């Protein structure tokens, strides 16, 4: 799939996108409801961060997957957003739970139609 990470028009180009045309992408995709559960979960972040993509599926990314994220800095811009009903926000972050400290590039961003919202990971 032809999208770069970043770009300002993602949350149209991804939009509805399956599971298996999210997997065609270049970065970690990760569709989250409001209260942070995993709807999607794309192959190149599986790859970046181990977890499985079937697996996480249903599972609670804040409580259960990624509590190294569950801090002002990540799951609070998170919560902020959901309850403004708008999310763009690009920072860097370490994950360091289940695996050697990695460094990423994350971009959240709310998904264009219903109460979803993206949250896209690249390696720096
Ligand atoms: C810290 O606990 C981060 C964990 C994590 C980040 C991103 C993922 O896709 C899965 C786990």
Redesign the pocket.
């Known amino acids: 799939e032809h999208v770069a990470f970043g770009s300002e028009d993602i949350e149209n180009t991804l939009a509805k996108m399956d599971d298996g045309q999210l997997d065609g992408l270049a970065f ?1 995709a ?1 569709q989250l409801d409001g209260d942070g559960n995993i709807l999607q ?1 794309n192959a190149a ?1 599986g790859d970046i ?1 181990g ?1 499985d993509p079937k697996q996480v599926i249903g599972k609670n990314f804040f409580k259960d ?5 569950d801090s002002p800095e990540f799951y609070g811009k998170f919560k902020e957003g959901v309850a403004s009903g708008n999310l763009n926000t690009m920072f860097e972050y370490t ?4 695996d050697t400290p990695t460094k990423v590039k994350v971009h959240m961003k709310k998904a264009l139609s219903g109460d979803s919202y993206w949250v896209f ?1 690249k390696r720096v």
């Open positions: 970690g990760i979960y972040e961060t977890r997957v990624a509590p190294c994220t994950f360091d739970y289940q990971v």
